[PDB]
């Protein structure tokens, strides 16, 4: 019923709804107007899509859905809590805004991200809506939950007229977002040298953000030369600022001659008296300090590449940029068939990342390592030392994450890390090496298992090894799970065999759910009760399918004793065994339900 | 190994009747084919070396150089990027060796910039084509000096005319 009144409001058919609103009264005409149709309301969709004639009529019926926040779609993403005035502004529907306001809509009602109608019109740049909202008492300085002001977002999108108008109407040029960002940074990141000049007309002060970045440095990172050129002669900046973009070129544009254009204007004025450079404590780069030695640079590309890497790492200081670029060069060399040096550049990046993020992307680097190893070993031969090092550095992150007691670790990053570790063990399983480090790897697995980690659905490392869903190993040929060899090391190392998850299941239950006779035989030989009773009073054997694995796979009479037969009667009839049996058998009864 | 006889016959025929920039010192499965520097263009002052591990009408070979090269359509490890080496018209089952060598010696004359492999070399060569960079000229002169030294050490240098 109302799902039809709203899809004609969205699609805008005004003649249809007038006849569906003549076949119903004015008391229930409001109930359909306050719909939940795909999260929005008839009045919201009427504003998002600019149907002025029908929004005015919708309001003559009931002006009570006018501040309702619902769902809207823009650029494919979906926005929650957007009122209709906000949505009419983001779309450019100027006359829908005017009508909405003449019916007394709050110019200050925001989305859940606290984005005002004013800010919405600034995004796509609807200047006339912006002026109208300002003239109807919009607040220039209400910002979203990140502190991003209207002026800020207007500078980021390069809207000079709107930014000018906002400054003209008194907007504060020196607002800082919560991350410390200023509108001067948004000019830098967008290359809006125009708007930067205008902000300076209002004495805009040039500051660092939370990340320590000035607009001048922010323009260097994102590569906007017009800003960086403009600011190397601004008296509000103190050679240092015209050498990070040289390495940024090698990172992004890969124009070697473009970089050689610099490092020479950055070294002639460095000597035109002398100044030294900080010394280190990667291929032993030893960056060039002599101009005469800084003459052969197009002779080889590798020297230029490593020098750029060094200068970026030094000046910027350890930040996603530097690790990103290090892994970038490593991946490029790996593509270009230099597997020896391409792997070494990634361990240093991982070590550097293991300081500032004690991360969403440390696991990304770990899985990139895993992908490279899978490609290399699927056929130079993979050395044992690098794989051991990657395994230890992988266990270190999990140990650090679990060890702290300040907040629970959400059970999905732990699941991803555990999957990475299991894949690494599977890769280790089939590399030949001597007996002096087999004990070492087994000791590492022992100390990893003794930590007692947990994952998704309170899972154990054995649980994942006996689960088919753990087989998420990447987009490369095969690391199929479950496998006998990978779990063989796990039980052979000392993993607990009777651990219980949230559903009160055991390794044997998960193994039986997938009908794998070898895994179940190995677990039973290792030792696990065949009669374990889970939450909904079920046993491991009863969770079997078809007949091929039902018969001749595992016989239940062999793994069942009279002790385990007499327990079922006790637990089904509640004979109060509390003090009539030896203390040892009490736990036996408590588990053999 | 059924086609080894035909491959050897073609090798003997080409050795008896070479065309241009086709010197073979085969020892095919381990063809140590040598590529020459045809004159009237860049480089041309030295003779290179190459290897092939061709595993014939269906499976393309793997042309690998020995001395490094700096131009857009090559992989720095050892490999070149050539469309006719990957299965509209690309890697017809016929036209095994002579066409491949002709295509390679033609492709080392005007690389394709629409889809590059060494982006740095691509940008440098595009700048040179726009024209004065002299970086490509410098690296070419250095590498032809090295190849001329190698050819003087073993073999005979290729003359400008035949």
């Amino acid at each position: 019923l109302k799902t039809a009144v709203f899809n004609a409001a969205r699609d805008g058919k005004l003649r249809l709804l007038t006849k569906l609103l003549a076949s119903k009264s004015k008391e229930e005409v409001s109930s359909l107007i306050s719909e939940k149709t795909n999260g929005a309301t008839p009045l919201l969709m009427a504003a998002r899509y600019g149907h002025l004639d029908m929004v005015e009529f919708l309001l003559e019926q009931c002006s009570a859905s006018i501040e309702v926040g619902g769902s809207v779609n823009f650029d494919g993403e979906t926005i929650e809590g957007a009122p209709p005035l906000w949505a009419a502004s983001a779309a450019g529907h100027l006359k829908v805004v005017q009508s909405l306001l003449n019916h007394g809509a709050s110019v200050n009602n925001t989305t859940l991200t606290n984005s005002t109608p004013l800010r919405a019109a600034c995004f796509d740049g609807h200047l006339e809506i912006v002026k109208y909202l300002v003239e109807h008492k919009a607040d220039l300085e209400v910002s979203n939950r990140h502190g991003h002001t209207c002026l800020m977002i207007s500078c980021y999108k390069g809207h000079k007229e709107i930014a000018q108008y906002l400054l003209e109407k008194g907007a504060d040029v020196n607002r800082k977002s919560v991350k410390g960002n200023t509108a001067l940074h948004d000019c830098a990141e967008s290359g809006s040298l125009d708007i930067m000049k205008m902000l300076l007309m209002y004495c805009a002060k040039m500051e660092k953000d939370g990340y320590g970045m000035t607009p001048l440095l922010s323009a260097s990172v994102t590569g906007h030369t017009n800003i960086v050129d403009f600011l190397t002669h601004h008296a509000q900046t103190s050679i240092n600022a015209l050498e990070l973009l040289g390495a940024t070129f090698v990172d992004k544009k890969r124009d070697l001659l473009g970089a050689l254009k610099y490092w020479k204007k950055a070294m002639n004025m460095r000597y035109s008296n002398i100044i030294s450079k900080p010394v280190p404590q990667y291929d032993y780069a030893k960056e060039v300090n002599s101009a005469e030695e800084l003459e052969g640079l197009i002779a080889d590309p590798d020297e230029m590449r490593m020098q750029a890497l060094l200068i970026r790492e030094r000046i910027l200081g350890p930040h996603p940029d530097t690790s990103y670029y290090i892994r970038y060069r490593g991946a490029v060399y790996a593509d270009s068939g230099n597997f020896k040096r391409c792997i070494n550049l990634w361990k240093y990046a991982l070590d550097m990342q293991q300081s500032n993020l004690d991360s969403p992307m440390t696991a990304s680097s770990l899985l990139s390592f895993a992908e490279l190893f899978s490609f290399m070993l699927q056929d130079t031969t993979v050395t044992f030392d690098d794989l051991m090092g990657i395994l230890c550095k992988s266990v270190l992150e999990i140990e650090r994450a679990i060890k702290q007691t300040q907040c629970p670790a959400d059970p999905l990053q732990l699941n991803k890390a555990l999957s990475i570790i299991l894949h690494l063990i599977c890769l280790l399983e089939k590399v030949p090496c001597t007996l002096e480090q087999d004990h070492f790897k087994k000791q590492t697995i022992y100390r990893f298992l003794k930590l007692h980690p947990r994952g998704k659905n309170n899972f154990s490392p054995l649980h994942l090894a006996v689960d088919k869903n753990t087989t998420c190993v990447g987009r490369y040929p095969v690391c199929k799970f479950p496998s006998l060899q990978v779990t063989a090391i796990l039980i052979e190392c000392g993993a607990d065999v009777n651990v219980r998850d949230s559903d009160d299941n055991s390794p044997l239950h998960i193994a039986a759910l997938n009908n794998h006779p070898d895994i179940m035989n190995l677990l039973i030989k290792s030792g696990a009760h065949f009669d374990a009773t889970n939450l909904h009073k079920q046993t491991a054997s009863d969770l079997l399918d078809e007949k091929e694995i039902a018969k001749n796979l595992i016989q239940p009479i062999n793994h069942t004793t009279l002790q385990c037969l007499a327990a079922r009667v006790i637990v089904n009839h509640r004979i109060y065994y509390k003090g009539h049996i030896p203390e040892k058998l009490e736990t036996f009864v408590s588990l053999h339900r | 190994t059924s086609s080894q006889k035909a491959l050897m016959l073609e090798l003997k025929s080409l050795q008896e009747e070479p065309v241009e920039g086709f010197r073979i010192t085969l020892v095919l499965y381990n063809w140590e084919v040598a590529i020459f520097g045809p004159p009237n263009t860049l480089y041309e002052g030295g003779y290179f070396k190459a290897h092939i591990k061709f595993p014939y009408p269906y499976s393309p070979p793997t042309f690998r150089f020995l001395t490094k090269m700096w131009h857009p359509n090559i992989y720095e490890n050892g490999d070149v990027c050539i469309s006719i080496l990957h299965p509209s018209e690309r890697w017809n089952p016929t036209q095994n060796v002579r066409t491949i060598l002709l295509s390679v010696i033609s492709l080392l004359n005007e690389p394709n910039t629409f889809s590059p492999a060494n982006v740095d070399a691509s940008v440098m060569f595009r700048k040179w084509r726009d024209s004065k960079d002299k970086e490509y000229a410098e690296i070419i002169r250095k590498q032809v000096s090295a190849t001329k030294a190698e050819a003087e050490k073993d073999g005979v240098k290729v003359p400008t005319t035949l």
Binding site: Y324, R327, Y328, A331, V332, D335, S364, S368 | C81, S115
Partner: peptide
């Protein structure tokens, strides 16, 4: 023409 990373 791997680089399975994003900024």
């Amino acid at each position: 023409c791997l680089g399975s990373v994003n900024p």
